[PDB]
Design a binder for this molecule. Structure first.
Ligand SMILES: *[C@@H]1O[C@H](CO)[C@@H](O)[C@H](O)[C@H]1NC(C)=O
Ligand SMILES: *[C@@H]1O[C@H](CO)[C@@H](O)[C@H](O)[C@H]1NC(C)=O
Ligand SMILES: *[C@@H]1O[C@H](CO)[C@@H](O)[C@H](O)[C@H]1NC(C)=O
Ligand SMILES: *[C@@H]1O[C@H](CO)[C@@H](O)[C@H](O)[C@H]1NC(C)=O
Ligand SMILES: *[C@@H]1O[C@H](CO)[C@@H](O)[C@H](O)[C@H]1NC(C)=O
Ligand SMILES: *[C@@H]1O[C@H](CO)[C@@H](O)[C@H](O)[C@H]1NC(C)=O
Ligand SMILES: *[C@@H]1O[C@H](CO)[C@@H](O)[C@H](O)[C@H]1NC(C)=O
Ligand SMILES: *[C@@H]1O[C@H](CO)[C@@H](O)[C@H](O)[C@H]1NC(C)=O
Ligand SMILES: *[C@@H]1O[C@H](CO)[C@@H](O)[C@H](O)[C@H]1NC(C)=O
Ligand SMILES: *[C@@H]1O[C@H](CO)[C@@H](O)[C@H](O)[C@H]1NC(C)=O
Ligand SMILES: *[C@@H]1O[C@H](CO)[C@@H](O)[C@H](O)[C@H]1NC(C)=O
Ligand SMILES: *[C@@H]1O[C@H](CO)[C@@H](O)[C@H](O)[C@H]1NC(C)=O
Lengths: 451, 451, 451, 451
């Protein structure tokens, strides 16, 4: 039994570092600053030299146009090689051409209360597929004023903060040189390309680094709720498109192929309650998903080669970016669970044999104990979402309310804005919540001390 | 017994989601940003273009006048439809006309010490109903200089941060167009409409949004303590005045009527110690209060219809705003307790039968244990209020002192200003407090471990 | 026994609220903002209109002179009644005349290493009574350039942040009007009144409020370590000098006299281990000290009456301010202990009879348990003071190091500057400290669980 | 046995304060501000008068040159004695001459993917000893353009934040007067001395204070990752070079010599498991290392005397600085352990005899218990490093990830940027992590309660 356990043990052991190698391998070291520099160059810089606001600060259409005609242009251009080629920082190819896309909602999408109909001329509803405006508004001279479809326009429907956004919409592709772009943008500002009915806009472009080999894909996402104002959001994604430069990369490629053999091996083992079975399956399921993504999704790299043919177009990476994220997402989770699988054998046989007997024993009862606090914990969350959420960003969404309470329990708090929101309940809420939580838990010890 | 318990159970179950529907229904999703944009447009913007202060920063009369003649004007006007109609952000009707009101205290309200009487000419006491100045000061040409009564002037006495303020006072109603208003304001600054004896001022106006159907009521409240300086405060209240637009709204209306039947049903059940009885009554009491507010208070909507007749006046919503707050306040609390009522049945019968037996058992003793820390906890609070409260905002009020200590226990702290306040006791206070609290609790475990 | 205990009980009860009345009585409500406005007017305002620094920011002599010739002047003057009388905010008498005093250290106070003697001409040692420079430097035309003694110059030696400072030194008294003062200050800047050897400067003045009856005493304390630079510090003290205006004040006066009778009563009771005896004595001792301060120290009020004769001089309140602080300090502590005396009787007889038996029992052992962590806790404190304290303000002083660790345990942390200080030990220090502390305590439970 | 234990006890006792004296002695009091003033003068000041960025803010080459030609120059010069001698603050000798050094990487150090070779002309790899560029680029007129070796150029290879940096490189030594330096710097900017291939630059200079006797050594370290941008870092080190000024210093010198006798005494005692043996050895080992550093490393002081001959050169203290740090590092650790050695005797004999019996008993089992959380704690750390670390600075390095989680557990958190990084996993990560950690620990109590 021991040697058989030892075999599945050492097999697991090899499988460990192999994955650890891939992770450590597939992740370059200094990538962070590559983002941070990009981010600070765009997000963090004053909209205009005379302006005190960053991109994170944009409150208005005027704010937006300033930014577009502002640092964004200067952020995307340098002198400096073609000279149509502009190296960012001097170190970064601006890859292809940037693209701007917006969304628009129809006039009569909404309805005016009968009393104010004599007053109000028209309204514009919150964005929806139904409320989508496909009419060719404006001079209709270009894709800016001409509607297109996410089928026709290669792209993936994106999930925004207030709503999901279909890839389709009104878009425009920029120019190679800063001057030509400004000419385009000006017309887009001159003629009104941002009107009452424009809910969300996209600015997307890709950037390549030649020093280390990586691709920076940038999604600048600006929303315009029916309430007006501006909600800026951004995405900076590094990507490794070309897997082969160094032999070390080729060294990793063999590993992944070898890594596939392990999974192939474990899959057979899965054939036949149990908890660790329920645990082990999770590891395998995630594993398969990654590779499938890794191959028939990510290994495509068509758009690249397609872009490599003619580099004057827009190199849509949104999918490729989107997926490798999920890939990075999944793979990370696997490793996490991979470390967890360590316990069942090396610890249970000797060390935690005196623990698991207590651990798994109470683990059944722990379910019964933990029932009480959540309901209470959820109640405040629901309460706070009702009282607050019209006031404090932290309570804006019911989800974030839950998250906020953890920060509260851990001590991260903005108390002032709470008291500003409600001079009465908020303090009461804050106190009672914190108060009961301890008082609640202390009882649970006792019913645990029952044993 | 079980089926009878099952009936009161499923009955409770239906009553749950019905309320959940109403809450989820009566609360729109994106309302938060509607406030946030409004707030950031007023509270968060520089008083003047050359000025570095926000509305939250106002320290002086000069600060105030700048703000009034500053962003406030520009915040209330846009171009843009009448053109007397100015859409905020282009998306928001400025509803009716804004109104400014101030309070004033009589000359001899206070008394000078005999020694300095030769020095000081006059004083002005802290605001009170007695100290109220009803004399028609100044040119006496308008409501600005003419006192009016909260009976005559429709309004609700408001509860400020240092004091309650009667609705009566000296007020002025603005104009439709920004220019005419500035003319008014200038005269109010030219002639001195803010003098030694002006304790508190009000700026109130309402804003309607046509996209989603809502009303933003704004209370800008500025105080002037007898000590001078300025204490800014603000209120941004969304309101749903017209309950019927979508059929979904009509769907909710039937629910509330149906919802009333439940309460009517439970009221009869209340007829006849007990804790859960003491619990259940609370649910019912709050429930009734809400609906009464919901009907003969809020459903009035007279001022609206009154305003809808002639829109050039000031549409006082202060009550309507004030109440629906309380309504939102109460309803939220109900839901909270509604979730709590879950425990007594589903959990007690099976799961917490092994818990409630311990829970309710120690719940009696917990009262005896918890006595010790509060007295100690209160002592520091009272101590801190004596030592501090002349120094640190967090200790300014005895109430907030209590709240401050929680942040301290949870770790939210400004230590510097404390040490700045008192280089000696504060650190001692801070250390000892934190120190004993743990040391105190640890003992309480033992007397609990006694069982 | 019970009635006898009941008598000492109700006697204690009356004594409670009597003190509570005095405290609540002797403390006015809104005093806080009176300070806050004063503070924000001076500490918080830009040194110059073109300048971005506050008084808290001053790094240099130039910084200082700017401040003096800057906001300070404008902060002390308004238009506005005499007109030699300038009401601050229009609400506050500038009381008497402000005063500036500095300290100076002799040339050869220090000694140069023999190697650099050929290089360096002279040095100036850290401030000390020995290093004090009494020589009449400069043009010697005024108290600015003429040394005076704290005996001759009425004043109390003050305890600064790096050192205690004798009241004696070089001082100058300002003028009534802003213009005349600037003339003085300019000469003090024109001629060099701040030289290499000036360690510390004082700016002190008093301000009276006529609305509520109070006195604001302001100590602006600037230090110049031998290392150069500037360490600003400030003191804003409210004072109630005239105890009699309202009959309510007279109502309080009788109480304090009545309050004295209680102490007189308890003193006799003290005549005769015990803990509560050791407790009770503390209450009495502090009590006596307060009244003695209250009478033959504070009730003096001579300087006032002296100032009231001729108001053109400097009204030194430093003592009067200094003492009532200590008075407020002591009285607060008393109340704290007063609440503590509640336990021994009402709780011990019924409620905590089941607690004190455990409480006082383990209270002996708690001493033995708590020994271990302090030594460890102190060690890190001493360690951190060695590693840090040349880097992080929080560790600058060994005292503050201790305080810093509490914030760390409670979660208030600046981690960045720590890692900036030492990329190695700091993180190690931080981790290990936090780590052991929990690990340490958990053991202590067990030896407590021993019972 | 007791007297023998008493002898080793009192011997230890004397050894305690002797060290305490040395520490307290070897550390001057006010040193902190000496740094803080220096730091704030350089790190904290706007690059240019019109500029809003500090040295900590530098994002670019342009940023850098501005700083060099900016505050740095003004920070290093004052008027003021020679006049070639410029006293900083007027209180600080600029010691010798400052020095600037940079690093450079060869052209073909890296390799371009075959597809973009037609596009990209050249790349520059991340810094390495191999990638080092020793070619004499540029006009080759000076050490700026002429490569030198760390053998030839006296210096110690320094450990930077992204990489270790050999002392060798391209350097330049500044002038005595600000004007001459600017002439040098301009040429270095005029001609391009910062190119694509410059990874890291050094600015190093020393500053002496004559008031207290100390030396400030300044290392300004700027990095340029292959990704572009700028990573500023700084080091401000006080040093006591001349050990003899006051007799008190001579008093300390005898102590250290006497202090050596103790160690000499304890070394013999070490001759012969045990834990305290394992403890005691550590104390001795560290002790020896310090003195060896103290003598044949630090007591050298040659460069000083060498510099004292001719003061126009660059006084390299980098080693002397580097070592005394380690010295201060080690000595601090010793004291920490010195306090720890207290327990084994005074506490074990009487007080903790009732504790150590429990302490050391469970101390064996504690190892078994603590196994579970670390693996879990590490997992999140590894997970977070995979998910984050491309986004959040706090997760940038796997090491800092661990540190970040402590702040999270203690409550120090930036939640926003996390949610900004990943709208999904981050919140999930945050919640689950915090959630399990408590849930994990609670079980461990039970298996501990097993006893
Ligand atoms: C929107 O529809 C309303 C409804 O008749 C109409 O009055 C208004 O002119 C329309 N505006 C636009 C821009 O389509
Ligand atoms: C559409 O018409 C406008 C009106 O002159 C013109 O400025 C714009 O360039 C036209 N668009 C295109 C794509 O030609
Ligand atoms: C989508 O990709 C195809 C592939 O050649 C291309 O022809 C087409 O123009 C693309 N459509 C876009 C980018 O909207
Ligand atoms: C206020 O009353 C005092 C008391 O006589 C008087 O001297 C002063 O002129 C009055 N001022 C005003 C503005 O009423
Ligand atoms: C009151 O008189 C002043 C003095 O000219 C004048 O400016 C103001 O307009 C008058 N008020 C009204 C309401 O007419
Ligand atoms: C109060 O409301 C009534 C209702 O018509 C109106 O006539 C009156 O002018 C109002 N008073 C105010 C707004 O002061
Ligand atoms: C200080 O004393 C030194 C010692 O001789 C002397 O050289 C220097 O001139 C003196 N300076 C002043 C200002 O007294
Ligand atoms: C001292 O002499 C200077 C030199 O002119 C003069 O400016 C100053 O006013 C004099 N001081 C006094 C108090 O007269
Ligand atoms: C101290 O007070 C006495 C009291 O009259 C006064 O004569 C003297 O001038 C004062 N000395 C000062 C303020 O330096
Ligand atoms: C770098 O090497 C490449 C490879 O041939 C060459 O094309 C380029 O001109 C070189 N540039 C420099 C600055 O050495
Ligand atoms: C190297 O040549 C340049 C070109 O004129 C000159 O400016 C520079 O001063 C020279 N360097 C030295 C050290 O002479
Ligand atoms: C290293 O020190 C020696 C000692 O005299 C000196 O001659 C040489 O110039 C120094 N080299 C440097 C500072 O690069």
């Amino acid at each position: 039994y021991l040697k058989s356990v030892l075999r599945e043990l050492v097999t697991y052991l090899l499988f460990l570092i192999v994955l650890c190698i891939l992770t450590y391998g597939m992740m370059s070291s200094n990538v962070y600053y590559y983002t941070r520099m990009m981010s600070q160059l765009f997000l963090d810089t004053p909209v205009s030299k005379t302006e005190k606001t960053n991109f994170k600060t944009l409150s208005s259409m005027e704010d937006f146009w300033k930014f577009t005609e502002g640092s964004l242009l200067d952020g995307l251009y340098w002198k400096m090689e073609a000279d149509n080629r502009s190296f960012i920082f001097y170190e970064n190819l601006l890859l292809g051409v940037p693209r701007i896309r917006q969304l628009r909602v129809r006039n009569g999408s909404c309805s005016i209360p009968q009393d104010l109909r004599d007053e109000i001329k028209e309204c514009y509803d919150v964005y929806s597929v139904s409320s989508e405006d496909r009419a060719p508004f404006g001079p209709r001279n270009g894709t800016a004023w001409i509607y297109t479809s996410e089928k026709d326009l290669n792209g993936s429907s994106h999930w925004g903060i207030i709503a999901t956004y279909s890839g389709a919409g009104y878009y425009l592709d920029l120019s190679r040189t800063r001057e030509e772009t400004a000419a385009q943008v000006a017309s887009l500002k001159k003629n009104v390309w941002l009107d009452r009915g424009t809910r969300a806009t996209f600015i997307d472009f890709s950037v390549y680094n030649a020093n280390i080999n990586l691709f920076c894909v940038v999604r600048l996402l600006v929303e315009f709720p029916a309430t007006g104002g501006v909600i800026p959001s951004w995405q900076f994604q590094p990507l490794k498109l070309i897997r082969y430069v160094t032999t070390f990369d080729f060294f990793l490629a063999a590993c992944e192929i070898i890594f596939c053999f392990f999974i192939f091996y474990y899959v057979v083992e899965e054939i036949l309650r149990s908890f660790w079975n329920c645990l082990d399956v999770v590891i395998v399921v995630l594993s398969v998903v990654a590779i499938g993504i890794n191959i028939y999704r990510t290994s495509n790299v068509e758009v690249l080669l397609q872009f490599l043919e003619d580099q004057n177009t827009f190199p849509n990476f949104e999918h490729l970016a989107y997926w490798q994220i999920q890939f990075n997402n999944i793979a990370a989770v696997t490793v996490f669970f991979v470390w967890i699988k360590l316990f069942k054998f090396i610890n249970f046989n000797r060390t935690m044999s005196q623990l698991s007997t207590t651990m798994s024993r109470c683990a059944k009862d722990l379910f019964g104990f933990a029932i009480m606090p959540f309901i209470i914990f959820l109640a405040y969350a629901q309460l706070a979402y009702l009282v607050f959420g019209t006031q404090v960003d932290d309570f804006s969404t019911f989800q974030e309310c839950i998250f906020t309470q953890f920060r509260i329990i851990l001590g991260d708090i903005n108390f002032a804005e709470i008291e500003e929101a409600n001079r009465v309940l908020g303090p009461i809420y804050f106190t009672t919540f914190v108060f009961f939580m301890f008082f609640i838990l202390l009882n649970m010890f006792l019913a645990i001390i029952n044993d």
